Amino acid sequence: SGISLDNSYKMDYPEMGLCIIINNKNFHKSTGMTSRSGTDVDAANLRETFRNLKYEVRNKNDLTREEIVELMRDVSKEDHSKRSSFVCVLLSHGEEGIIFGTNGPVDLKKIFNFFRGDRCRSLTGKPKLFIIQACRGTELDCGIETHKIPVEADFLYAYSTAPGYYSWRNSKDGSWFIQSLCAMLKQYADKLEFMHILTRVNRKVATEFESFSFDATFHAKKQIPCIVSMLTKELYFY
């Protein structure tokens, strides 16, 4: 016969999968929210990176909360059967458990749930990756001187910042997290397992980034991303 090594997700389906990017930069005046300058750098970076990983990228810009919800429902209702994985990247204002459409908040759970194993059957047993570049609160980090499978299984949530903390963005370079995310993918998606890649992202953001502000309250601050993993196998992009 033949022996084992099913430790790794099956990534040789005919298609790698969809890569959806929601790029919210311009917010309705009535919401009180600022334009997210530099997010266009992120959105381009992400598209090119996941293009090279052979994902079918779809860039969406400035979506209302209703559009966000409808978008993810529609996509959850697609037949994903010939696809290895699903990828969603959110670039917006946020709070803990919340992403903002242009005109208001969307519960992150409400989005995630469209893809639960019981609810999106052609992704059952396949890696579902949510990449969230957004605030999770208003804490600043001042740093220090050196029934057969769960319906929640096979999700990875790669958050840009720790629970409760601000997430930083550079208007010229793009967000610290997406910058580092893309760069490590380029460098290591042919060499490393995904969790090890995200760990380099944690190191890069932690070590190489520190805020410079004319506002003492916001100056010399630090950031650490947050990997949240329900994956049941190793994920390689080769």
């Binding site: 997210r36 300058s37 917006s92 204002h93 946020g94 570049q133 957004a134 605030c135 208003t138 840009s160 601000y166 997430s167 930083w168 963005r169 550079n170 208007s171 967000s175 805020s211 410079f212 502000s213 916001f218």
Partner: peptide, 4 residues
């Protein structure tokens, strides 16, 4: 640098 700005908060997001």
């Amino acid at each position: 640098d700005e908060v997001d």
